[PDB]
Design a binder for this molecule. Structure first.
Ligand SMILES: *[C@@H]1O[C@H](CO)[C@@H](O)[C@H](O)[C@H]1NC(C)=O
Ligand SMILES: *[C@@H]1O[C@H](CO)[C@@H](O)[C@H](O)[C@H]1NC(C)=O
Lengths: 50, 49
């Protein structure tokens, strides 16, 4: 994965074979750390109109 | 790619496998690419005395 977002510590249950995770259609919201085993959560950071 | 799936679920019925739904997680991806067209089942028999 590549891009910008907030990396949080969610409580998702990632199976051993699972590596990535989408939300609705090709929108990644949670990944797995390559070095460690902890599960992150890619969240789009603060946006909005002025 | 040899996608092996396995799901060990206990049951109390002897024959006529019951209905229902179950999942199958990938066990391990085996390196393949050879030509395979015939599958042969290999069981084990218990020789007695
Ligand atoms: C990878 O290296 C980092 C470096 O500190 C270490 O913390 C981590 O445990 C290592 N991961 C594995 C799976 O060995
Ligand atoms: C695999 O071998 C069989 C045996 O004749 C042949 O019919 C088939 O075309 C072969 N498949 C490939 C992909 O080589």
């Amino acid at each position: 994965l590549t891009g910008t977002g907030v990396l949080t510590e969610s409580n998702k249950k990632f199976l051993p074979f699972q590596q990535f995770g989408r939300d609705i259609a090709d929108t990644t919201d949670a990944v797995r750390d390559p070095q460690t085993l902890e599960i992150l959560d890619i969240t789009p950071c603060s946006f909005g109109g002025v | 790619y040899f996608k092996i799936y396995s799901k060990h679920t206990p049951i109390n019925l002897v024959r006529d496998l019951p209905q229902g739904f179950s999942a199958l997680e990938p066990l391990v991806d085996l390196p393949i690419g050879i030509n395979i067209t015939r599958f042969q089942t290999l069981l084990a028999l218990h020789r007695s005395y």
